[PDB]
Design a binder for this molecule. Sequence first.
Ligand SMILES: Cc1cc2nc3c(=O)[nH]c(=O)nc-3n(C[C@H](O)[C@H](O)[C@H](O)COP(=O)(O)OP(=O)(O)OC[C@H]3O[C@@H](n4cnc5c(N)ncnc54)[C@H](O)[C@@H]3O)c2cc1C
Length: 295
Amino acid sequence: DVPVNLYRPNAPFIGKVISNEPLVKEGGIGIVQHIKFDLTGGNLKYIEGQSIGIIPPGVDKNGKPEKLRLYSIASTRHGDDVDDKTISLCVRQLEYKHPESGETVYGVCSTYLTHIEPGSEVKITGPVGKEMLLPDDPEANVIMLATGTGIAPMRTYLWRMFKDAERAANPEYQFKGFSWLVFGVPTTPNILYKEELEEIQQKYPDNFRLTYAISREQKNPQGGRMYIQDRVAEHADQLWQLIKNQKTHTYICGLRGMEEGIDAALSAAAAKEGVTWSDYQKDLKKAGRWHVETW
Ligand SMILES: Cc1cc2nc3c(=O)[nH]c(=O)nc-3n(C[C@H](O)[C@H](O)[C@H](O)COP(=O)(O)OP(=O)(O)OC[C@H]3O[C@@H](n4cnc5c(N)ncnc54)[C@H](O)[C@@H]3O)c2cc1C
């Protein structure tokens, strides 16, 4: 039984911030924070791949109360401390420039969150979502294609799969399949959770492969900046081969529009064996083995 909407916008759970730490190292672009909330006092439960809503304080330009913003859960069902008492988010502060203005605009909910102080009460809703769930089969293969904060659900899968404390807590899920994360960010300092991701690959070289697409530090064969679609094209045949397995699941998460280049690359690979990717993909989606969530 997948937990869903234990709390709703009309009566959200009031959680308390425990910690708020920077994920972007010096020399990186933008601000992305790892924020953990205390769930004690309530009955909010969740599983990997889901999201929760956050209702920021204040009113919008029209004087109306701000609505909730959804955020991908970044922690396993047990929380970062494996105590079933918390939940974490991976939040980027939205920033952009206005047309012919010159001044930076800051997102309401993301700025509120990235600068929130420990001890502060936060309105939480959810959890929600059933399209990014991880299979219970410990023999399944999991391809993870992420950009930016799209790394959030991937962290929940990878932690449950490879963290010592998680394995000790989940006797029913001892991952033995193969997982491959292709992560695209602009700089090395922007590689969210770099240290831990690399520790996992070192400990499980036969069960986890980590591939980076660093735009400001790498160039693709055509001379352009390296993006995730370039890495997918680079390993298109291998990825297609893994995708043909009845037990393989693929997850796409992050920047809206990242799907197009990925499909073009896989389409070229599948075509070599007389397969139309777009059609094969449709069946995968219907079977619940092709998961996508972008924003
Ligand atoms: C399922 C789901 C999961 C999500 N997961 C995450 C996550 O894990 N981490 C995360 O950081 N975010 C995530 N998001 C995005 C999140 O919900 C918010 O939309 C985001 O934080 C921005 O909200 P805000 O309140 O800060 O911005 P707002 O104050 O709501 O401003 C947003 C508005 O700014 C304008 N705008 C935005 N960009 C530009 C631009 N480039 N040029 C001109 N105008 C622009 C648009 O009109 C837009 O509607 C997720 C969204 C969904 C739907």
